[PDB]
Design a protein around this ligand. Structure first.
Ligand SMILES: O=C(N[C@H](CO)[C@H](O)c1ccc([N+](=O)[O-])cc1)C(Br)Br
Ligand SMILES: O=C(N[C@H](CO)[C@H](O)c1ccc([N+](=O)[O-])cc1)C(Br)Br
Ligand SMILES: O=C(N[C@H](CO)[C@H](O)c1ccc([N+](=O)[O-])cc1)C(Br)Br
Lengths: 139, 139, 139
């Protein structure tokens, strides 16, 4: 399997807090750790492919966001993980291969990829968490 | 005194220039050094607390933004300071403790924190200055 | 010649991709390498000067964006260059001097600076490219 970077980058951010939550400045995605229940939605990621009639659309996670077939948002200090599941909102079939999430069939797919909490993680340490995904194609 | 990070981060930015000022790209907060008079407003910082009925709301400045009971925006190269005063627009009572600005009474406060130039600093070197404040609670 | 930093910074970004292009997240400026033809427009840069009746308006490129009288966007890893020409949309006369693009006559100029591909570069490696320009004056 080989991923070819060819596209833009989408960044999913989430600030985890305690019950007493202090929002400073402009609105951003924030949740209390108590809200990090199994399958809790974190946010959608739009995907729009062009010129891929003969390639399999793919998204590659930053090195710090995957390890051992698993994906996760990572804290600013690179220490804490928030495991997630990545799933298209439609019925399309995809595969995971070492940090790469690719579509099973060729074509210029457009769609929404949902990012969901994988397993209850209500003990997550408060902090700023990020998941970075780069567009490209797999073969 | 102890601060518990629990909330989002607000960033106050200011570009200081000379009288001949060249604005490139999108509008941003910029002032000539001549405008850095005592009590000159730099910008507001919104604060919205939730779930803090039994905690004292607090904002903690980045390590590089405070020293010796004083707050300041810091240049990109970490060298130059622009001393400021931090004050809520309403009549609420707050206290400063080693980089932490906390509310005297418990409660889920919502309000505006003003950032003002502390003492005339019309000699400030031109550059990009930042003040970073993180939400949480104090005890 | 001497440039005095005095103003804000404008950042021109461009993501280069292959024909199969996967856009992830919010819209950003992206082009296939095949679109990097000679004189292809990359994007405009607004300039608004104030208080410069007796100074020559100038823009200085980041150190990593110029070398030997030539300007270029640079990849995230600092390795790959995309040579460009910088030109005002109006009929004003400007000069280039070691990374500095300055106006020939004094005055508080307001205008648009166009960034164009300099020579066909359809072999550019896919990646994220940036050109940073800071406002100030020259003498
Ligand atoms: O964000 C997700 N789900 C939500 C909240 O349930 C929602 O269903 C939704 C769907 C689609 C879009 N969109 O296309 O912009 C926004 C919000 C998940 Br996908 Br993680
Ligand atoms: O910015 C401040 N003051 C100004 C300019 O005087 C102003 O009064 C104002 C008040 C409130 C808001 N707001 O709630 O968004 C914006 C501008 C200071 Br506070 Br530093
Ligand atoms: O972007 C440029 N040119 C385009 C596309 O041709 C266009 O002419 C244009 C002109 C002016 C503005 N503007 O003032 O915001 C936007 C787009 C070039 Br300049 Br590189």
């Amino acid at each position: 399997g080989s991923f070819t970077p060819s596209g833009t980058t989408g960044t999913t951010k989430l600030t985890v807090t305690e019950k007493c939550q202090v929002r400073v400045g402009d609105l951003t995605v924030a949740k209390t750790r108590g809200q990090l229940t199994d399958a809790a939605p974190i946010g959608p990621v739009t995907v729009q492919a062009l010129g891929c009639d003969a390639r399999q659309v793919a998204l590659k996670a930053d090195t710090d966001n995957f390890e051992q077939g698993k994906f996760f948002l990572i804290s600013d200090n690179n220490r804490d993980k928030l495991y997630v599941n990545i799933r298209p909102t439609d019925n399309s079939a995809w595969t995971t291969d070492n940090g790469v999430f690719y579509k099973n069939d060729v074509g210029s797919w457009g769609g929404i990829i949902g990012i969901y909490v994988d397993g209850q993680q209500t003990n997550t340490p408060p902090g700023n968490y990020t998941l970075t995904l780069t567009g490209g194609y797999w073969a």
